[PDB]
Symmetry: C2
Subunit: 122 residues, 2 copies
């Protein structure tokens, strides 16, 4: 034996040290976040442009929730792990919950049923 | 299975112990294979359904060449490493060169411009 590295779990896809999961049906932002935590994951975070482009391409025609939320249109975007969004990429709209749509990041109320993405480290 | 290295190279995407690259611009099958070869890779192979489902999604709304070829419509499909295709999935048509389109595998002659995906092992 030599030393090897864990592959993403079955049905998860890797970019770098991250593993990502794309849901098979649409629910609200709260349900999506609960789902991700039940998978020892979080609603999806991206930390660079390579991850962000992957997430946008792979979610495709399905508008997809990710793990950014703000208390109001006046408060900073935060990840679900309660760290600040670094604001490298613009989020459109005036909503408190972020989602990917075509090649844009947008925002809306949480109640809308959308596909979602989970991410975890591995 | 387990991976030989911690991650895919930058800009490649991982499913289990394989790493994939989407061309992002279209050319003929022959140019596509030469490109993959120059990256120490090949036109995309899949060795299971998970990998195939990933490729059918990773290509987005574009078709994509893959690494299956045959001498004629009356010869068995082979991978670009010339190992036999295990025939788990049907391939439509009578062309010599395989590509993904929507959720099926089709075939055609080579000098048609299409996107491509490369694959290699991690
Ligand atoms: Cl194409």
């Amino acid at each position: 034996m030599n030393k090897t590295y864990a592959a993403c779990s079955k049905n998860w896809t890797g970019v770098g040290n991250k593993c990502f999961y794309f849901s098979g049906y649409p629910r609200n932002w709260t349900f999506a976040q609960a789902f991700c935590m039940a998978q020892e994951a979080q609603l999806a975070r991206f930390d660079n442009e390579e991850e962000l482009i992957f997430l946008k391409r792979f979610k495709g025609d399905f508008d997809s929730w990710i793990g950014l939320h703000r208390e109001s249109s006046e408060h900073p975007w935060k990840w679900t792990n309660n760290t600040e969004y670094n604001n490298m990429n613009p989020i459109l709209g005036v909503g408190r919950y972020a989602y990917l749509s075509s090649d844009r990041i947008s925002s809306s109320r949480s109640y809308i049923n959308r596909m979602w993405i989970c991410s975890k480290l591995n």
